[PDB]
Structure formats: C-alpha cells, structure tokens
Ligand binder design. Structure first.
Ligand code: HEM
Ligand code: EIA
Length: 390
C-alpha cells in the first residue's frame, strides 16, 4: 500500500495530492496500527468529521492508525462520541463562545505587546518564536485556567511529549503521572479556597454540582492544557513566515488593517500545519465514499490539509490570496470535535498581526530564507527559530 504521511518539507504541500484528488478513495499504511482510507476531498473530510456514521472510538478491536508509537487513549474529549462527548464538552462550552472570547481581546493584545517589548529590547535580529509565538498563547490559556507563569515550562514539556511521534506508552505514563500530581495539587488548593478561574470552575462542577467525576475534571484540564497553546504558537510563526516570504511582506495589512481577519482565515486554509494526521474515524456501517465502499469498522483519516486545497472548492488552491475569502476551510475541523478554541485562536492570530503591522511595518526575515530551520519529521510543521529584523 501507499505509505502515509507523505514526503514534504516545511509548509510544502506535496504534489501527490494532485494525483489523489482525481482518484477514488485510496487505502494507505501508517507508521503504527491498522491501515486506513485517506479522505482528501472537501466533502469527504467533512463527512468523516461530522457524519454520525464515523466514530472516533475504536469499538471493534481496531489498532489505531497513527504516527505515534503509543496509541492516543484517555478520558477526554477526543476519546468520546456524542452524546457522551456532548455532555462532557458542555462543561467547557460557555467559556469559549464568541461572546465570551471577544472579551479576552484586550488581554491578548496586552500580553502580545509585552512580548514584543521584550523582543524589541533584545535587538534586531530577534527570534519571534522564542519572544512571542511560544510565550503569548501559553500565557493566555494558563492564566485562563489558573496556572502561574513560572510553571508554564512544565506544561510545554507535557504538551510536546503528547505531540512527539517518538513517545512510547511509558513516556505517556510518566506524563500522566506528572500531570496528575500537579493538577492534583491545584485541586486540593482550590478545595481549600475558591478562585474565579477555569480550573476552579471545573472543581465546582465536580464537587458542588456532581456534573462530572474527578477523572473527567482532570481530563478536561489536560485537553485544554495540551491542545491549547502549542498549535497557536506554531501558527504565529508559520503565518508570519508565509507573509514575510512575499515581496510586499506585511505592507498590505499595514495599508488595510480591516483585511487582517480574512488574511488569518486564508492562512488557516493554506498552511499545512500537520506533518501527520489527527484522530482516525471508523465507519459504524457500510457506506460509499469517492467510489469506494468503506466497510463497517474500517478507518478513514480526515486529511484537513488536502480538504483545504480541494481543486473544485478552491480555484488555484496553491495560491495564498489574502482576499480569497473562500468557502469555509476545515482548519479548525468540523462536526462534534470542531476546535473548542477556534475563536480564541482567531483572536490570538488577528491580534498578533495587528501588533506586528502597527509596530513593525517593515518586518522582514533576519536571516536568508533558505537558512530557516524548519522542523523535520515532526508531528506539526513549523520553525525551530524565526529570526526577524525591523
Ligand atoms: C491555530 C490554532 C489551532 C488550530 C489550527 C486548531 C485545530 C484543531 C482541530 C482541527 C481540531 C479537531 C481535530 C479533529 O477533529 O481530529 C481541534 C480540536 C481541539 N482544539 Fe484546537 N486548534 C487551535 C487552537 C486551539 C486553542 C487555542 C485551544 C484552546 C482551548 C484548542 C483546544 C482544542 C480542543 C480541546 C480540541 C478537542 C475538542 C473536542 O474533541 O471536542 N485548540 N483543534
Ligand atoms: C493544529 C491542531 C492539531 C491538534 C492540537 C492538539 C491536539 C493534541 C492534544 C489534545 C488533547 C490531549 O492531549 N489530551 C490529554 C488526554 C490524553 C489522550 N491520550 C492521548 O494520547 C491523547 C492525544 O495524543 C491527543 C492528541 C491531540 C492531537 C490534537 C492535534 C491535532 C491537530 C489538528 C489524548 O487525547
């Protein structure tokens, strides 16, 4: 069988997809676990993520298709189908609606400003990744939850083990052991004095309301502290890099600040954030997909990066047109597991571009472009460093 993931470097979209779009659904072999079909068409990836005939749970003895040694199993939102998924997620729901998240815009700019003060203080050329991409989204969610600043490094280390393809079940055991004790302390302390942060709301939901159990309370906090900043950090650098590599660099968004939200959406469609793939889904009944009968139990991988370049949904899909304003990308997913932080991420990315254009309109790469240190063979695509000058 065709091997997957496919060869690519940086944010390169590999040409093999232009072949597969014209072809029927094709089966592939993965680094670990069972084989799977590759959903790449826009409508198919949508069906995998939102049709109730595709379950995220391997309830038929499947060995999960994956790029990581130890399979991704736990008690959080990615381990559940509706309605069970829907009940647990509703514990967090109200805190991530657009109405709640628009309120954080001011603070997001505050932290973004503080990061750039430090970056500018360090002198040109400086590493945008270390000075902004990493600290800002980390600070945002950690202070949403109630995690103090000097412990941020701990949650970065835990998050990277989850996302590293060389993680064994043993490392995941270690992470789990270390994360449970740390959150174990915050629980005791919030039981000994309430606080108006988000982990404190989880403690009320477990202890006062009986809505959730202790391990569910822990799981939800793990989900948000694992999925909640590393992806944004990668995108801040990926987006800036895409923009700085063009002749006009940031000038168009300097000239037309009102077009920043669209640029954020276009970049979300264009950037192949993933080197691997997310969770496979499993057909719960026989069904037809791009000329193939997918049988009950068989796995299908939703390749978000290919959906976002469907040749019939997006004309000239390889072109980054910040005015494209195309049909809705699947970059935050779709259906039940559609990113709970989608708006927070849009807010974070919009503000970063506001602050960078208003402050460094002549931003530019600080090293030659071909010297850039793209991460090789990682789960997410991105940069080890992003030197910038101004
Ligand atoms: C650019 C930044 C981000 C991107 C590209 C992104 C993308 C995604 C995607 C595509 C999914 C669905 C994956 C699948 O269904 O297989 C997802 C799920 C999730 N994301 Fe995000 N996300 C981003 C930022 C965030 C932020 C800021 C948060 C903060 C809460 C977050 C928390 C989550 C959680 C908890 C889930 C699982 C939800 C569920 O299973 O119900 N992500 N993300
Ligand atoms: C740019 C967007 C990214 C996105 C960003 C973060 C998510 C990752 C982290 C989310 C949750 C999390 O760790 N919770 C702790 C429970 C343990 C449980 N046990 C596992 O082993 C496990 C995983 O490995 C999960 C991997 C998630 C892949 C997700 C990524 C897919 C892309 C679309 C579990 O869910």
């Amino acid at each position: 069988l065709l091997t997957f993931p496919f060869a690519s470097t940086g944010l390169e979209f590999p040409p093999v997809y232009h072949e597969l779009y014209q072809q029927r659904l094709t089966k592939v072999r993965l680094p670990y676990g069972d084989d799977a079909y590759l959903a790449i068409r826009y409508a198919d990836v949508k069906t995998v993520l939102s049709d109730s005939r595709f379950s995220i749970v391997a309830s038929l003895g499947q060995d999960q298709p994956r790029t990581r040694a130890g399979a991704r199993v736990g008690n959080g939102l990615f381990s559940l189908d509706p309605p069970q998924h829907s009940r647990l997620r509703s514990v967090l729901g109200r805190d991530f609606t657009p109405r709640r998240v628009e309120k954080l815009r001011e603070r997001v700019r505050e932290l973004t400003d503080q990061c750039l003060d430090r970056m500018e203080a360090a002198g040109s050329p400086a590493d945008l990744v270390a000075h902004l991409a990493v600290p800002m989204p980390t600070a945002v969610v950690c202070e949403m939850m109630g995690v103090p600043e000097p412990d941020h490094h701990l949650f970065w280390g835990w998050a990277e083990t989850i996302l590293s393809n060389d993680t064994t079940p043993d490392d995941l055991i270690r992470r789990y052991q270390e994360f449970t004790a740390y959150m174990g302390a915050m629980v005791e302390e919030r039981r000994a004095r309430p606080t108006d942060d988000m982990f404190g709301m989880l403690v009320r939901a477990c202890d006062e309301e009986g809505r959730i159990t202790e391990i569910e309370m822990h799981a939800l906090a793990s989900d948000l502290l694992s999925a909640g900043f590393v992806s944004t950090a990668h995108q801040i650098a990926n987006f800036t890099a895409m923009l700085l590599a063009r002749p006009e660099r940031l000038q168009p968004l300097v000239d037309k600040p009102e077009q920043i939200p669209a640029a954020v959406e276009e970049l979300m469609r264009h950037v192949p954030i993933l080197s691997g793939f997310s969770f496979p889904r499993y057909a719960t009944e026989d069904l037809e997909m791009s000329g193939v009968t997918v049988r009950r139990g068989e796995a299908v991988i939703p390749v978000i990066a290919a959906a976002n370049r469907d040749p019939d949904v997006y004309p000239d899909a390889g072109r980054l047109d910040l005015e494209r304003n195309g049909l809705p990308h699947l970059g935050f997913g779709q259906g039940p597991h559609f990113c709970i932080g989608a708006h927070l991420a849009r807010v974070e990315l919009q503000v970063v571009l506001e602050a960078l254009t208003e402050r460094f309109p002549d931003l530019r790469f600080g090293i030659p472009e071909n010297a850039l240190k793209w991460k090789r063979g990682h789960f997410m695509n991105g940069l080890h460093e992003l030197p910038v000058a101004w």
